[PDB]
mmCIF file of C-alpha atoms and ligand atoms in Angstrom:
data_model
loop_
_atom_site.group_PDB
_atom_site.id
_atom_site.type_symbol
_atom_site.label_atom_id
_atom_site.label_comp_id
_atom_site.label_asym_id
_atom_site.label_seq_id
_atom_site.Cartn_x
_atom_site.Cartn_y
_atom_site.Cartn_z
ATOM 1 C CA UNK A 1 88.454 109.159 112.848
ATOM 2 C CA UNK A 2 88.726 105.927 114.886
ATOM 3 C CA UNK A 3 92.172 104.526 115.732
ATOM 4 C CA UNK A 4 90.845 101.240 114.364
ATOM 5 C CA UNK A 5 87.758 100.142 112.434
ATOM 6 C CA UNK A 6 86.503 96.828 111.070
ATOM 7 C CA UNK A 7 83.402 96.535 108.877
ATOM 8 C CA UNK A 8 83.613 92.730 109.121
ATOM 9 C CA UNK A 9 82.426 93.114 112.728
ATOM 10 C CA UNK A 10 79.530 95.388 111.730
ATOM 11 C CA UNK A 11 77.309 92.804 110.022
ATOM 12 C CA UNK A 12 77.954 94.093 106.498
ATOM 13 C CA UNK A 13 80.440 91.506 105.252
ATOM 14 C CA UNK A 14 79.502 88.109 103.832
ATOM 15 C CA UNK A 15 81.445 84.971 104.765
ATOM 16 C CA UNK A 16 84.783 84.363 103.052
ATOM 17 C CA UNK A 17 84.307 82.721 99.659
ATOM 18 C CA UNK A 18 86.493 80.412 97.543
ATOM 19 C CA UNK A 19 87.415 81.368 93.957
ATOM 20 C CA UNK A 20 89.072 78.064 93.068
ATOM 21 C CA UNK A 21 91.260 77.712 89.978
ATOM 22 C CA UNK A 22 90.015 80.870 88.289
ATOM 23 C CA UNK A 23 91.717 84.282 88.356
ATOM 24 C CA UNK A 24 88.536 86.001 89.472
ATOM 25 C CA UNK A 25 89.811 87.874 92.514
ATOM 26 C CA UNK A 26 88.671 91.028 90.731
ATOM 27 C CA UNK A 27 85.084 89.722 90.678
ATOM 28 C CA UNK A 28 85.115 88.628 94.329
ATOM 29 C CA UNK A 29 86.538 91.958 95.473
ATOM 30 C CA UNK A 30 83.741 93.649 93.512
ATOM 31 C CA UNK A 31 80.866 91.554 94.892
ATOM 32 C CA UNK A 32 82.324 91.904 98.380
ATOM 33 C CA UNK A 33 82.321 95.709 98.095
ATOM 34 C CA UNK A 34 78.811 95.860 96.627
ATOM 35 C CA UNK A 35 77.543 93.468 99.304
ATOM 36 C CA UNK A 36 78.979 95.751 102.003
ATOM 37 C CA UNK A 37 77.871 99.046 100.463
ATOM 38 C CA UNK A 38 74.370 97.626 99.955
ATOM 39 C CA UNK A 39 74.144 96.366 103.549
ATOM 40 C CA UNK A 40 75.442 99.679 104.901
ATOM 41 C CA UNK A 41 72.911 101.638 102.839
ATOM 42 C CA UNK A 42 69.841 99.391 103.125
ATOM 43 C CA UNK A 43 70.358 97.318 106.263
ATOM 44 C CA UNK A 44 70.140 94.061 104.302
ATOM 45 C CA UNK A 45 73.186 91.847 103.737
ATOM 46 C CA UNK A 46 72.954 89.379 100.859
ATOM 47 C CA UNK A 47 75.623 87.427 98.967
ATOM 48 C CA UNK A 48 76.076 88.511 95.334
ATOM 49 C CA UNK A 49 77.141 86.813 92.081
ATOM 50 C CA UNK A 50 80.779 86.723 90.952
ATOM 51 C CA UNK A 51 79.816 84.509 88.005
ATOM 52 C CA UNK A 52 77.566 87.187 86.510
ATOM 53 C CA UNK A 53 80.572 89.533 86.419
ATOM 54 C CA UNK A 54 82.851 86.841 85.000
ATOM 55 C CA UNK A 55 80.404 86.070 82.167
ATOM 56 C CA UNK A 56 79.120 89.585 81.525
ATOM 57 C CA UNK A 57 81.855 92.191 82.064
ATOM 58 C CA UNK A 58 83.072 92.176 78.444
ATOM 59 C CA UNK A 59 85.925 94.575 79.203
ATOM 60 C CA UNK A 60 87.445 92.079 81.650
ATOM 61 C CA UNK A 61 88.751 88.612 80.789
ATOM 62 C CA UNK A 62 86.714 86.265 82.980
ATOM 63 C CA UNK A 63 88.865 83.656 84.714
ATOM 64 C CA UNK A 64 92.099 84.985 83.201
ATOM 65 C CA UNK A 65 91.850 88.373 84.915
ATOM 66 C CA UNK A 66 89.611 91.418 85.182
ATOM 67 C CA UNK A 67 88.955 94.716 86.923
ATOM 68 C CA UNK A 68 87.088 95.963 89.955
ATOM 69 C CA UNK A 69 86.054 99.283 88.376
ATOM 70 C CA UNK A 70 84.793 97.623 85.179
ATOM 71 C CA UNK A 71 82.569 95.451 87.371
ATOM 72 C CA UNK A 72 81.005 98.453 89.133
ATOM 73 C CA UNK A 73 80.498 100.213 85.797
ATOM 74 C CA UNK A 74 78.787 97.111 84.396
ATOM 75 C CA UNK A 75 76.497 96.958 87.442
ATOM 76 C CA UNK A 76 75.420 100.590 87.040
ATOM 77 C CA UNK A 77 74.847 100.060 83.321
ATOM 78 C CA UNK A 78 72.779 96.891 83.786
ATOM 79 C CA UNK A 79 70.540 97.922 86.662
ATOM 80 C CA UNK A 80 72.207 95.875 89.369
ATOM 81 C CA UNK A 81 73.889 92.589 90.159
ATOM 82 C CA UNK A 82 72.327 89.139 90.646
ATOM 83 C CA UNK A 83 72.480 87.217 93.920
ATOM 84 C CA UNK A 84 74.899 84.372 94.603
ATOM 85 C CA UNK A 85 71.896 82.051 94.839
ATOM 86 C CA UNK A 86 70.338 83.080 91.510
ATOM 87 C CA UNK A 87 73.555 83.080 89.457
ATOM 88 C CA UNK A 88 75.842 80.364 90.969
ATOM 89 C CA UNK A 89 79.625 80.359 90.763
ATOM 90 C CA UNK A 90 81.097 77.942 88.191
ATOM 91 C CA UNK A 91 84.731 79.018 88.510
ATOM 92 C CA UNK A 92 85.059 79.260 84.722
ATOM 93 C CA UNK A 93 84.013 81.414 81.761
ATOM 94 C CA UNK A 94 80.343 81.170 80.848
ATOM 95 C CA UNK A 95 77.569 82.758 78.816
ATOM 96 C CA UNK A 96 76.175 86.004 80.191
ATOM 97 C CA UNK A 97 72.685 85.361 81.588
ATOM 98 C CA UNK A 98 72.034 88.838 83.008
ATOM 99 C CA UNK A 99 68.808 89.201 80.983
ATOM 100 C CA UNK A 100 67.346 86.193 82.808
ATOM 101 C CA UNK A 101 67.910 87.703 86.268
ATOM 102 C CA UNK A 102 64.915 89.155 88.101
ATOM 103 C CA UNK A 103 66.078 90.460 91.478
ATOM 104 C CA UNK A 104 69.115 92.738 91.440
ATOM 105 C CA UNK A 105 71.095 94.791 93.945
ATOM 106 C CA UNK A 106 71.790 98.229 92.477
ATOM 107 C CA UNK A 107 74.492 100.811 93.125
ATOM 108 C CA UNK A 108 74.272 104.559 92.517
ATOM 109 C CA UNK A 109 77.748 105.110 91.109
ATOM 110 C CA UNK A 110 81.358 104.167 91.781
ATOM 111 C CA UNK A 111 84.676 105.803 92.518
ATOM 112 C CA UNK A 112 88.230 105.208 91.382
ATOM 113 C CA UNK A 113 91.605 106.459 92.541
ATOM 114 C CA UNK A 114 94.740 105.741 90.568
ATOM 115 C CA UNK A 115 97.889 107.131 92.178
ATOM 116 C CA UNK A 116 100.422 109.110 90.155
ATOM 117 C CA UNK A 117 104.035 110.030 90.919
ATOM 118 C CA UNK A 118 102.606 113.374 92.022
ATOM 119 C CA UNK A 119 100.940 111.932 95.125
ATOM 120 C CA UNK A 120 102.663 111.428 98.483
ATOM 121 C CA UNK A 121 102.299 108.410 100.753
ATOM 122 C CA UNK A 122 100.601 110.521 103.427
ATOM 123 C CA UNK A 123 97.955 111.662 100.941
ATOM 124 C CA UNK A 124 97.506 108.106 99.648
ATOM 125 C CA UNK A 125 97.057 106.668 103.153
ATOM 126 C CA UNK A 126 94.775 109.545 104.176
ATOM 127 C CA UNK A 127 92.410 109.212 101.212
ATOM 128 C CA UNK A 128 92.271 105.413 101.452
ATOM 129 C CA UNK A 129 91.474 105.401 105.172
ATOM 130 C CA UNK A 130 88.827 108.010 104.411
ATOM 131 C CA UNK A 131 87.200 105.781 101.767
ATOM 132 C CA UNK A 132 87.338 102.676 103.962
ATOM 133 C CA UNK A 133 85.497 104.422 106.811
ATOM 134 C CA UNK A 134 82.636 105.151 104.401
ATOM 135 C CA UNK A 135 82.556 101.662 102.864
ATOM 136 C CA UNK A 136 84.921 98.770 102.042
ATOM 137 C CA UNK A 137 87.038 99.325 98.943
ATOM 138 C CA UNK A 138 88.616 97.016 96.379
ATOM 139 C CA UNK A 139 92.315 97.357 95.577
ATOM 140 C CA UNK A 140 94.536 95.718 92.971
ATOM 141 C CA UNK A 141 97.595 94.004 94.418
ATOM 142 C CA UNK A 142 100.540 91.703 93.716
ATOM 143 C CA UNK A 143 99.598 88.490 95.538
ATOM 144 C CA UNK A 144 102.857 86.630 94.798
ATOM 145 C CA UNK A 145 103.346 85.769 98.504
ATOM 146 C CA UNK A 146 99.722 84.942 99.356
ATOM 147 C CA UNK A 147 100.256 81.183 99.057
ATOM 148 C CA UNK A 148 102.987 81.580 101.721
ATOM 149 C CA UNK A 149 100.806 83.549 104.146
ATOM 150 C CA UNK A 150 99.407 81.922 107.275
ATOM 151 C CA UNK A 151 98.998 84.823 109.691
ATOM 152 C CA UNK A 152 100.364 88.006 111.235
ATOM 153 C CA UNK A 153 100.931 91.378 109.571
ATOM 154 C CA UNK A 154 102.236 90.939 106.017
ATOM 155 C CA UNK A 155 104.950 93.516 105.264
ATOM 156 C CA UNK A 156 105.380 93.101 101.513
ATOM 157 C CA UNK A 157 107.857 90.230 101.646
ATOM 158 C CA UNK A 158 109.055 89.428 98.123
ATOM 159 C CA UNK A 159 107.161 92.217 96.381
ATOM 160 C CA UNK A 160 109.241 94.754 94.489
ATOM 161 C CA UNK A 161 108.742 97.275 91.695
ATOM 162 C CA UNK A 162 107.197 96.820 89.257
ATOM 163 C CA UNK A 163 104.249 95.442 91.223
ATOM 164 C CA UNK A 164 102.097 93.115 89.175
ATOM 165 C CA UNK A 165 98.317 93.291 89.257
ATOM 166 C CA UNK A 166 97.407 89.621 89.511
ATOM 167 C CA UNK A 167 94.778 89.839 92.238
ATOM 168 C CA UNK A 168 92.325 92.044 94.154
ATOM 169 C CA UNK A 169 91.280 92.116 97.814
ATOM 170 C CA UNK A 170 88.667 93.946 99.866
ATOM 171 C CA UNK A 171 89.893 96.420 102.472
ATOM 172 C CA UNK A 172 87.254 96.323 105.212
ATOM 173 C CA UNK A 173 89.153 98.136 107.925
ATOM 174 C CA UNK A 174 92.373 98.931 109.728
ATOM 175 C CA UNK A 175 94.024 98.653 113.115
ATOM 176 C CA UNK A 176 97.417 98.639 114.794
ATOM 177 C CA UNK A 177 99.461 96.147 116.809
ATOM 178 C CA UNK A 178 102.547 97.044 118.847
ATOM 179 C CA UNK A 179 103.097 100.206 116.820
ATOM 180 C CA UNK A 180 102.586 98.459 113.475
ATOM 181 C CA UNK A 181 99.618 99.751 111.462
ATOM 182 C CA UNK A 182 97.706 97.494 109.075
ATOM 183 C CA UNK A 183 94.698 97.160 106.783
ATOM 184 C CA UNK A 184 92.214 94.346 107.332
ATOM 185 C CA UNK A 185 91.775 92.693 103.937
ATOM 186 C CA UNK A 186 89.209 90.049 103.010
ATOM 187 C CA UNK A 187 90.519 87.479 100.537
ATOM 188 C CA UNK A 188 88.602 84.936 98.436
ATOM 189 C CA UNK A 189 90.657 81.790 99.016
ATOM 190 C CA UNK A 190 88.447 80.125 101.612
ATOM 191 C CA UNK A 191 88.163 80.674 105.362
ATOM 192 C CA UNK A 192 91.048 78.257 105.991
ATOM 193 C CA UNK A 193 93.529 80.620 104.315
ATOM 194 C CA UNK A 194 95.289 83.251 106.414
ATOM 195 C CA UNK A 195 93.427 84.677 109.402
ATOM 196 C CA UNK A 196 89.999 83.110 108.902
ATOM 197 C CA UNK A 197 90.226 84.031 105.218
ATOM 198 C CA UNK A 198 91.662 87.512 105.836
ATOM 199 C CA UNK A 199 95.156 88.991 105.642
ATOM 200 C CA UNK A 200 96.509 91.949 107.612
ATOM 201 C CA UNK A 201 98.570 94.171 105.326
ATOM 202 C CA UNK A 202 101.018 96.618 106.869
ATOM 203 C CA UNK A 203 100.413 100.254 105.947
ATOM 204 C CA UNK A 204 102.483 103.438 106.202
ATOM 205 C CA UNK A 205 105.601 101.453 105.236
ATOM 206 C CA UNK A 206 107.008 104.452 103.398
ATOM 207 C CA UNK A 207 106.378 103.450 99.784
ATOM 208 C CA UNK A 208 103.815 105.625 98.004
ATOM 209 C CA UNK A 209 102.415 102.583 96.175
ATOM 210 C CA UNK A 210 101.978 100.686 99.433
ATOM 211 C CA UNK A 211 102.675 97.022 100.163
ATOM 212 C CA UNK A 212 102.797 95.087 96.890
ATOM 213 C CA UNK A 213 101.320 98.150 95.171
ATOM 214 C CA UNK A 214 98.000 98.023 97.042
ATOM 215 C CA UNK A 215 97.706 101.860 97.179
ATOM 216 C CA UNK A 216 97.842 102.141 93.377
ATOM 217 C CA UNK A 217 94.281 101.533 92.202
ATOM 218 C CA UNK A 218 91.358 101.699 94.617
ATOM 219 C CA UNK A 219 87.755 101.438 93.441
ATOM 220 C CA UNK A 220 84.436 101.176 95.240
ATOM 221 C CA UNK A 221 80.671 101.206 94.662
ATOM 222 C CA UNK A 222 78.706 104.210 95.907
ATOM 223 C CA UNK A 223 75.243 103.824 97.432
ATOM 224 C CA UNK A 224 73.272 106.491 99.288
ATOM 225 C CA UNK A 225 71.398 105.464 102.447
HETATM 226 C C1 LIG B 1 109.659 85.185 99.979
HETATM 227 O O1 LIG B 1 110.100 84.054 99.215
HETATM 228 C C2 LIG B 1 110.758 83.064 100.024
HETATM 229 C C3 LIG B 1 111.347 82.032 99.080
HETATM 230 O O2 LIG B 1 110.364 81.523 98.192
HETATM 231 C C4 LIG B 1 109.761 82.499 101.034
HETATM 232 O O3 LIG B 1 110.371 81.452 101.812
HETATM 233 C C5 LIG B 1 109.953 80.162 101.514
HETATM 234 O O4 LIG B 1 108.647 79.964 102.082
HETATM 235 C C6 LIG B 1 108.113 78.653 101.791
HETATM 236 C C7 LIG B 1 106.684 78.614 102.308
HETATM 237 O O5 LIG B 1 106.597 79.101 103.639
HETATM 238 C C8 LIG B 1 109.009 77.571 102.411
HETATM 239 O O6 LIG B 1 108.508 76.279 102.088
HETATM 240 C C9 LIG B 1 110.437 77.718 101.882
HETATM 241 O O7 LIG B 1 111.290 76.803 102.556
HETATM 242 C C10 LIG B 1 110.942 79.149 102.099
HETATM 243 N N1 LIG B 1 112.241 79.318 101.476
HETATM 244 C C11 LIG B 1 113.316 79.503 102.235
HETATM 245 C C12 LIG B 1 114.672 79.220 101.609
HETATM 246 O O8 LIG B 1 113.247 79.886 103.403
HETATM 247 C C13 LIG B 1 109.285 83.634 101.940
HETATM 248 O O9 LIG B 1 108.302 83.133 102.868
HETATM 249 C C14 LIG B 1 108.483 83.505 104.207
HETATM 250 O O10 LIG B 1 109.739 83.070 104.733
HETATM 251 C C15 LIG B 1 109.906 81.633 104.781
HETATM 252 C C16 LIG B 1 111.302 81.358 105.309
HETATM 253 C C17 LIG B 1 108.813 81.004 105.650
HETATM 254 O O11 LIG B 1 108.965 81.438 106.993
HETATM 255 C C18 LIG B 1 107.435 81.418 105.128
HETATM 256 O O12 LIG B 1 106.423 80.908 105.983
HETATM 257 C C19 LIG B 1 107.336 82.944 105.058
HETATM 258 O O13 LIG B 1 106.087 83.318 104.495
HETATM 259 C C20 LIG B 1 108.675 84.756 101.085
HETATM 260 N N2 LIG B 1 108.349 85.902 101.920
HETATM 261 C C21 LIG B 1 107.128 86.073 102.435
HETATM 262 C C22 LIG B 1 106.008 85.150 101.992
HETATM 263 O O14 LIG B 1 106.880 86.962 103.254
#
């Protein structure tokens, strides 16, 4: 395995998007992962629709909150996801128009990993790095400090147990700086936020659940080449 890896430099990651005043991080983390997995498997990178997920994933709650795995499940069940162009983002709840969509990007399946008190940090870090090398993954996280972030490696700051799940980000890679390891995470708050729209999250901090609970629930779309 590489000492560092960044899918955002491999031509499989779309530009950083802006979710606005809508708690749809779950949807952006999901489209971001599908966009990457699709590009990695087919060689074609195309921006996908967060709005379709917001309006159609009945198990989630649109702009209030939702889930990455429920989005992937919905995509498998409905033959694919619409493009950003064909199903524009409205930043608010809307009527599901999936039946009116012609072109769709499909996924073969999806994976999920929910940590239990039986796992160790080493195993958590190992499995996650393993998934990331195959394709970007979505993770739930407590983004309480995100509006304070401007750059550098975020170490968890004000996060503490219990970690709330109020946001999702896309882990596209990892690296290390001066002996400090970190994940490269794509956010959906515009390119002006953080490091060109991304945030470096410290890893191997010692807590099984990771920084702000990011190790807790990973989920990703699966697509064969
Ligand atoms: C943890 O919470 C602290 C209190 O809310 C954060 O500090 C506050 O950050 C604000 C935005 O940067 C700033 O306007 C406040 O003055 C400051 N509060 C105090 C009393 O310092 C803290 O943010 C980090 O630390 C502060 C001091 C600044 O350097 C921020 O830029 C840092 O992000 C939070 N910890 C984090 C976000 O890691």
